[PDB]
């Protein structure tokens, strides 16, 4: 039981210990490409790089590097792409990645400005009538509509490969109230956001891996993927007890360093999986309760 384990860790007040244990055991793989001098200005943070074995390669001959990892969860049967907040010079790379990997959804867990600093380029258009064109990767991007909720916004985007004139619809899920290095206001509002993403079809196997990012693409991004995968796993055999949260996290950290950046984020992940189990185990009414409790409008 994750619920049993959770209480033991709370009673003894040992979340920091548990979390430090995961850091001590996490995988360590080379990040040779990310460290090449020609890629310095493609990385937002010197200490957050993608492993060479799991990094996403751009289909261009010039420089295939982007700070982005493919998290392939074999047992759960779901893939995600975790990446940093695009930089001013990598917004074209970012949308080229979306195109080549055939993704249908982009989950953004951060705001453009956080704690007084710019954490992310403004890589999508805020006005229908002002589209964006990425000359370096020959892509066009157009805002088609928005659904603005109280703490998150869903945007419908049209992405056009300008070489072939083929268009694609991308769903942008923008979480606005999740603090840098912190946790969401409640399990209910996190799970309500997660199920909005699930209900869009973006995590389906007919599409490419969903792109998930925050600023560095590890802390908030890691929390989002860990909860989803844990919920998907227990969905598979309707067996909450078969899910070991720390083992899933460690398996995820085989594909990208540093997923989940604080002990409280680890603790939150437990809360979210524990609450979401209610829905997995046949109480469909809990989804509306989350929506209410979240106050999206």
UniProtKB/Swiss-Prot annotation:
Free-text tissue specificity from the UniProt record: Expressed in keratinocytes (at protein level).
Keywords: Acetylation, Endoplasmic reticulum, Hydrolase, Membrane, Oxidation, Phosphoprotein, Protein phosphatase, S-nitrosylation
Modified sites of kind Cysteine sulfenic acid (-SOH): 214
GO molecular function: cadherin binding; enzyme binding; ephrin receptor binding; insulin receptor binding; non-membrane spanning protein tyrosine phosphatase activity; protein kinase binding; protein phosphatase 2A binding; protein tyrosine phosphatase activity
Modified how: Oxidized on Cys-214; the Cys-SOH formed in response to redox signaling reacts with the alpha-amido of the following residue to form a sulfenamide cross-link, triggering a conformational change that inhibits substrate binding and activity. The active site can be restored by reduction.
Disulfide bonds: none
Full-sequence portion shown in this chain: 2 to 298 of 435
EC category name: hydrolase
Role summary: Tyrosine-protein phosphatase which acts as a regulator of endoplasmic reticulum unfolded protein response. Mediates dephosphorylation of EIF2AK3/PERK; inactivating the protein kinase activity of EIF2AK3/PERK. May play an important role in CKII- and p60c-src-induced signal transduction cascades. May regulate the EFNA5-EPHA3 signaling pathway which modulates cell reorganization and cell-cell repulsion. May also regulate the hepatocyte growth factor receptor signaling pathway through dephosphorylation of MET.
Family the UniProt entry places it in: Belongs to the protein-tyrosine phosphatase family. Non-receptor class 1 subfamily.
Taxonomic lineage of the native organism: Eukaryota, Metazoa, Chordata, Craniata, Vertebrata
Membrane topology recorded in Swiss-Prot or TrEMBL: Peripheral membrane protein
EC number(s) reported in the record: 3.1.3.48
Phosphoserine: residues carrying this PTM: 49, 241-242
Main localization of the protein described in the UniProt heading: endoplasmic reticulum
Record location of the N,N-(cysteine-1,S-diyl)serine (Cys-Ser) cross-link: 214-215
Subunit-structure text: Interacts with EPHA3 (phosphorylated); dephosphorylates EPHA3 and may regulate its trafficking and function. Interacts with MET. Interacts with NCK1.
GO biological process: actin cytoskeleton organization; cellular response to angiotensin; cellular response to fibroblast growth factor stimulus; cellular response to hypoxia; cellular response to nerve growth factor stimulus; cellular response to nitric oxide; cellular response to platelet-derived growth factor stimulus; cellular response to unfolded protein
Modified residues (S-nitrosocysteine): 214
Cysteine sulfinic acid (-SO2H) found at: 214
Localization in the cell: Endoplasmic reticulum membrane
Entry GO terms, CC: cytoplasm; cytoplasmic side of endoplasmic reticulum membrane; cytosol; early endosome; endoplasmic reticulum; endosome lumen; glutamatergic synapse; mitochondrial crista
Protein name: Tyrosine-protein phosphatase non-receptor type 1
Residue positions, PTM Cysteine persulfide: 214
Gene (name only): PTPN1
């Amino acid at each position: 039981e994750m619920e049993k384990e959770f209480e033991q860790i709370d009673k003894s007040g040992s979340w920091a210990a548990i979390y430090q244990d995961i850091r001590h055991e996490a995988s360590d793989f080379p990040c040779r490409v990310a460290k090449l001098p020609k890629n310095k200005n493609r990385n937002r943070y010197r200490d957050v790089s993608p492993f060479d074995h799991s990094r996403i390669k751009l289909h261009q001959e010039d420089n295939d590097y982007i700070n982005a990892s493919l998290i392939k969860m074999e047992e759960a049967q779901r893939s995600y792409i975790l990446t940093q907040g695009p930089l001013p010079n990598t917004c074209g790379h970012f949308w080229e990645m979306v195109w080549e990997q055939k993704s249908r959804g982009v989950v953004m867990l951060n705001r453009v400005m956080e704690k007084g600093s710019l954490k992310c380029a403004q890589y999508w258009p805020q006005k229908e009538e002002k589209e964006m064109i990425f000359e370096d990767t020959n892509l066009k991007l157009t805002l088609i509509s928005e659904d603005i909720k109280s703490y998150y916004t869903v945007r419908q985007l049209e992405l056009e490969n300008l070489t072939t004139q083929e268009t694609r619809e991308i769903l942008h899920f923008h979480y606005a109230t999740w603090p840098d290095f912190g946790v969401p206001e409640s399990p209910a509002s996190f799970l309500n956001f997660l199920f909005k993403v699930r209900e869009s079809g973006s995590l389906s196997p007919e599409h490419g891996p969903v792109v998930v990012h925050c600023s560095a693409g590890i802390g908030r991004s890691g929390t989002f993927c860990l909860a989803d995968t844990c919920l998907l796993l227990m969905d598979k055999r309707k067996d909450p007890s078969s899910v070991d949260i720390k083992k899933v996290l460690l398996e995820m950290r085989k594909f990208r360093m540093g997923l989940i950046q604080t002990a409280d984020q680890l603790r939150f992940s437990y809360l979210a999986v524990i609450e979401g189990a209610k829905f997995i185990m046949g109480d469909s009414s809990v989804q509306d309760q989350w929506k209410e409790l979240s106050h999206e409008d």
